[PDB]
Design an enzyme around this catalytic site. Structure first.
Site, mmCIF file in Angstrom:
data_model
loop_
_atom_site.group_PDB
_atom_site.id
_atom_site.type_symbol
_atom_site.label_atom_id
_atom_site.label_comp_id
_atom_site.label_asym_id
_atom_site.label_seq_id
_atom_site.Cartn_x
_atom_site.Cartn_y
_atom_site.Cartn_z
ATOM 1 C CE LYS A 159 -2.333 -0.797 3.676
ATOM 2 N NZ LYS A 159 -1.623 -2.053 4.012
ATOM 3 N N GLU A 185 0.900 5.658 10.024
ATOM 4 C CA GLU A 185 1.757 4.827 9.198
ATOM 5 C C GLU A 185 3.157 4.761 9.806
ATOM 6 N NE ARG A 186 5.467 0.615 7.098
ATOM 7 C CZ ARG A 186 4.627 -0.216 6.496
ATOM 8 N NH1 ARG A 186 4.222 -1.336 7.071
ATOM 9 N NH2 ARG A 186 4.176 0.088 5.285
#
Ligand SMILES: Nc1ncnc2c1ncn2[C@@H]1O[C@H](COP(=O)(O)OP(=O)(O)OP(=O)(O)O)[C@@H](O)[C@H]1O
Ligand SMILES: [Mg+2]
Lengths: 464, 50, 514, 36
Positions: A159, A185-186
């Site tokens: 994604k 998110e990261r």
């Protein structure tokens, strides 16, 4: 007439106020943590009025170090974020504090993160195709300019890679303003996006708001709203076409679930909060585009347990015009961008919008792929040799079509080494019409893997 | 009159509310603040102290 | 323009008078996540409409000895502890009248399309009794959906409750919008015994999707007899809960006045989700999938308003087309099971069939209509009698498609007939077929006139043939429409025109069909 | 008003150690410790 912390349970803080000064819901309150190692000003958001002049709040920063009885002062207004052309080219957090330049927008115009969705009178459907250059997307899941787009997927199916590729394919040449909301998110990929945008000179036209997963549930709830507020300012107060990338919008509902039981809500199915649909609907409806004011929003959606029947992705599906749906089954087979061609869909894929040729080719590709999926059970046991001649030819067609939907994307150079490629929509339609009709059955199937175009197909076939 | 007085200045109301502290202290605070003056009726003062 | 810009206000100022009526007040003691607890209001009644200070509205839904837990209908953030709550002495009611045709209204009956106000003829409480057993009548009049598959295999008769059930992006809203569009021919007749008035209830859909549906209806001419009761996802859980009841009330007003109504709930799954959210926020005990105990009742109480009334009550009918999204084609889930139990029949739409190109994608065989032939005109009943058996035999024989040389002559003929019937039931979107055209089309296939056309051309051969018949031999269509049966002389004329057309038809493969 | 002065005067008389009240299975509930 300041409040007083009574009860602290993880991210949730209860504050007792004097009777005449109970803050309204969604108001921002300021406590102070004085422990040296964790000293800070802690922003709480009034989430519930609980009676007896108590309110229950979701903390934006970690509550580690907060002490019962500490004074809590009410800001009198909801959490406000800076807005304007100043935000472009800078990195903000959920609270509107600039990261790459602390204290930068403190003097800009400030808008509340909470506002009602545009009235139904101002909404009209969007039916203009957005050519991304990705064969699978352009063919089977055409994106809508000014519409709502999603990249569903399990965990670690690509994604973030695909959303970065879409930033590379849509925003680089975009004349308007981009907003990227990193919602839980990261952080590594957030920094990678920041440096990529800086190197490509797109940063000057992009505003980044990060609420990455190191943060507690409060930020992972309100960061999407903080970025959507900037997007809405650009939509309304300036009329510029806006891109609104969000990664990952599931983290909003997941943070709501994380604070759900501490707020006293009885859990719903699969442990989600009872207000899943309404909470996500408000945010999603704020993202729509109103007539004459376009927001082209792309939302990476995370599917827990790779289960598309999970309440969160299932409820999010209703909010989207185009829905690319990455699957671990396709990812395992080496196909990148890892799109499931059958599960994915788009509302603009009608003969009246994309044309009869595009529609026919897309529907024939989907037909071949569905027949191949139905046959895969037979092939694995009875063998290909026992299929009908027509079905055998169809299987050979379908393998090549699946591999041709793979593409070497620019953002995936570090996944494959080779540079990215862009395929015009006309060339995609022509190539897939040829495939589905048979003009390439003589070429080996591995020639169709990670090529992106007919010229690349010929070159790789010759190299084989 | 005492009800409207205690409605104002909610700090005094909170101080009187705290029952963790000894009752004698709260009663003395009330007397010093409200019922220790000649204008307080005897029955009303007794009721407030109780 | 006019003096009204002032005059209206004058009429208000001259007519306005806020008189001093006694009122019972509560105070908000808790407020969170769309639920507000109101201490006081001793005489409040269950499901009453409370009004909060900021013009907000709520529904008194839990009544205890301590507080009244009310679900707030939008603008929840404006509710605070200590606010005064006044009770309106009216249970949930919505305005109803013919002025709602062509309007988009929120579950309270207030317009949201931006046009003028709606002139309400009357008000109806959302929780009025459904027609009783003695007050109903047998479902005997067709409601032509315009979809060959539904009208031939699982007919919907006005007064029925047919469930369009299937996974996402399978063609449900398409089926219901096609059904709404197909009623334009009936509407233009001007005969109330034929006119069908539509209520598209959107629950949990995004505003742009409701706008898209409204556009599809307007460009199809259906908006002059359709109302859209919209509860977009932006709206509170209370609106998503109430929208089906609002639409049902607007339809019921017409139904008891002799009109025929067509109610589309899209979806009832989101109705159930909103009710679950409200119930869990009010701390009502949960059950399977966390739904409250009475969730079935929630749907039943709704769908049982959809009835055909006896001639003593005007003979009006309300047809239900609830739409349910089944996750991963799991029709055994809780809400799908409940509504399959409640409804009179099911059009099961499957994504596998959709991808095979069988769109509108009704899984015939699994799909059923308990009203059956009583909901079909005699022509369709006789023509489509053999269609179901033929399709069943085709699905049995599909495994033999590769060995047609080794099958019996009858079996191979059945396989060839079935493939062409399957191609025949396919249909483009937003293009419903009048019942006469459906009769002729199914006549082509069931009687064997497609047995010479190639499969890949059947869709075209039908489309052209009707286009020919309409333009040149409309006597067949007029006979079927006016008499409701396919007479023998009309059948012979139809066969002759089919044979004449066959000679002039160019198969896509270049072969001749005769 | 004089109430504020009386409140202030009362405040003049109105290590930090708590006491375990419940304990078991690795969890201990501690009464006291206002400033924890
Ligand atoms: N008979 C048909 N022929 C061709 N395309 C169709 C047909 N029916 C539906 N479609 C297309 O299929 C897609 C899904 O249609 P639709 O919006 O009605 O689905 P739905 O089942 O209501 O799903 P959703 O949950 O998204 O509302 C749309 O692209 C629609 O154009
Ligand atoms: Mg739909």
């Amino acid at each position: 007439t300041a409040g007083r912390v009574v009860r602290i349970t993880g991210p949730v803080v209860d504050v007792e106020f004097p009777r005449g000064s109970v803050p309204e819901l969604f108001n921002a309150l300021h406590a102070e943590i004085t422990f040296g190692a964790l000293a800070k000003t802690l922003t709480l958001e009034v989430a519930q009025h609980l009676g007896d002049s108590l309110v229950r709040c979701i903390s934006m920063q970690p509550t580690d170090g907060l002490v019962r009885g500490v004074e809590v002062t009410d800001t009198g207004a909801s959490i406000s974020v800076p807005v304007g052309d100043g935000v472009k080219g800078h990195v903000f957090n959920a609270l509107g504090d600039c990261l790459d330049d602390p204290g930068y927008g403190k003097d800009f115009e400030h808008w509340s993160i909470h506002r009602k969705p545009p009235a139904f009178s101002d909404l009209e459907p969007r039916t203009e195709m957005l050519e991304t250059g990705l064969k699978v997307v352009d063919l089977l899941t055409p994106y809508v300019r000014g519409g709502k787009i999603a990249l569903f997927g399990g965990a670690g199916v690509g994604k973030t890679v695909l959303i970065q590729e879409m930033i590379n394919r849509i925003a680089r040449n975009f004349g308007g303003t981009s907003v990227f909301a990193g919602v839980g998110e990261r952080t590594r990929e957030g920094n990678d996006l920041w440096v990529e945008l800086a190197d490509a000179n797109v940063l000057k036209d992009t505003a980044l708001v990060f609420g990455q997963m190191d943060e507690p549930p409060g930020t992972r709830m309100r960061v999407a709203l903080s970025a959507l507020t900037m997007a809405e300012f650009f939509r309304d107060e300036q009329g510029q076409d806006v891109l609104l990338f969000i990664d990952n919008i599931f983290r909003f509902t997941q943070a709501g679930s994380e604070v759900s039981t501490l707020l006293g809500r009885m859990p719903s199915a699969v442990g989600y909060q009872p207000t899943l649909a309404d909470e996500m609907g408000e945010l999603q409806e704020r993202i729509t585009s109103t007539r004459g004011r376009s927001i082209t929003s792309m939302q990476a959606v995370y599917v827990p347990a790779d289960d598309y029947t999970d309440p969160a992705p299932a409820t999010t599906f209703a909010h989207l015009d185009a829905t690319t749906e990455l699957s671990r089954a396709v990812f395992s087979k080496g196909i990148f961008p890892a799109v499931d061609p059958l599960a994915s869909s788009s509302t603009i894929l009608d003969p009246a919008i994309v044309g009869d040729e595009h529609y026919r080719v897309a529907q024939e590709v989907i037909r071949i792929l569905q027949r191949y999926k139905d046959l895969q059970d037979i092939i694995a046991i009875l063998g290909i040799d026992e299929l009908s001649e027509e079905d055998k030819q169809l299987v050979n067609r379908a393998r090549r079509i699946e591999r041709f939907l793979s593409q070497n994307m620019m953002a995936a150079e570090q996944f494959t080494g080779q540079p990215g490629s862009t395929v015009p929509l006309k060339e995609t339609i022509e190539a897939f019409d040829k495939l589905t009709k048979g003009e390439f059955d003589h070429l080996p199937e591995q020639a169709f893997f990670l090529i992106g175009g007919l010229d690349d197909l010929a070159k790789k076939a010759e190299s084989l | 009159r005492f009800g409207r007085v205690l409605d104002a200045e909610p700090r005094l109301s909170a101080l009187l509310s705290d029952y963790t502290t000894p009752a004698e202290g709260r009663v003395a605070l009330l007397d010093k603040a409200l019922t220790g003056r000649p204008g307080v009726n005897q029955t009303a003062a007794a009721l407030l102290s109780q | 323009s006019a003096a009204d810009i002032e005059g209206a206000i004058e009429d208000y100022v001259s007519s306005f008078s806020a008189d001093t009526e006694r009122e019972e007040i509560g105070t908000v003691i808790d407020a969170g996540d769309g639920i507000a607890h109101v201490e006081g209001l001793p005489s409040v009644m269950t499901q009453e409409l409370l009004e909060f200070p900021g013009g907000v509205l709520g529904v008194a839904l839990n009544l205890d000895e301590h507080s009244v837990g009310a679900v707030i209908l939008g603008e929840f953030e404006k509710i605070e502890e200590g606010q005064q709550v006044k009770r309106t002495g009216e249970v949930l009611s919505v305005p109803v009248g013919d002025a709602f045709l062509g309007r988009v209204v929120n579950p309270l009956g207030q317009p949201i399309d931006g046009q003028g106000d709606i002139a309400a003829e009357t008000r109806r409480a959302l929780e009025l009794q459904a027609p009783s057993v003695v007050q109903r009548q047998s479902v005997s009049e067709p409601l032509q959906t315009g979809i060959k598959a539904i009208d031939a295999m699982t007919p919907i008769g006005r007064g029925q409750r047919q469930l369009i059930i299937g996974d996402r992006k399978t063609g449900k809203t398409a089926v219901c919008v096609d059904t709404i569009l197909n009623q334009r021919e009936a509407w233009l007749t001007g005969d109330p015994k034929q006119q069908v008035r539509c209520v598209y209830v959107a629950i949990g859909q995004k505003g742009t999707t409701i706008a898209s549906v409204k556009r599809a209806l307007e460009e199809g001419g259906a908006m002059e007899y359709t109302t859209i009761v919209a509860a977009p996802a932006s709206d509170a859980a209370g609106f998503k809960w109430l929208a089906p009841y609002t639409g049902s009330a607007i339809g019921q007003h017409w139904m008891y006045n002799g009109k025929h109504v067509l109610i589309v709930f899209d979806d009832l799954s989101k109705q159930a989700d909103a009710y679950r959210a409200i119930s869990l926020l009010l701390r009502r005990p949960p059950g399977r999938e966390a739904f409250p105990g009475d969730v079935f009742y929630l749907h039943s109480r709704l769908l049982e308003r959809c009835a055909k009334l006896s001639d003593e009550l005007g003979g009006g009918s309300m047809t239900g087309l609830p739409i349910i999204e089944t996750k991963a084609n799991d029709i055994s889930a809780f809400i799908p099971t409940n509504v399959i139990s409640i409804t009179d029949g099911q059009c099961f739409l499957e994504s596998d069939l959709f991808n095979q190109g069988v769109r509108p994608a009704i899984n015939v065989g699994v799909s059923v209509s308990r009203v059956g032939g009583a909901a079909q005109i005699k022509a369709m009943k006789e023509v489509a009698g053999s269609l179901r058996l033929d399709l069943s035999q085709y699905r049995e024989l599909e495994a033999f498609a590769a060995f047609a040389s080794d099958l019996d002559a009858a079996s191979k003929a059945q396989l060839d007939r079935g493939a062409r019937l399957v191609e025949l039931l396919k249909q483009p979107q937003y293009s419903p077929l009048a019942v006469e055209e459906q009769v002729v089309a199914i006549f082509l296939g069931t009687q064997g006139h497609l047995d010479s056309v190639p499969v890949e051309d059947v869709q075209r051969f039908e489309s052209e043939l009707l286009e020919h018949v309409k333009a040149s031999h409309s006597d067949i269509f007029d006979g079927i429409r006016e008499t409701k049966k396919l007479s023998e002389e009309a059948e012979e004329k139809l066969v002759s025109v089919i044979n004449e057309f066959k000679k002039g038809f160019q198969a896509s493969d270049g072969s001749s069909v005769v």
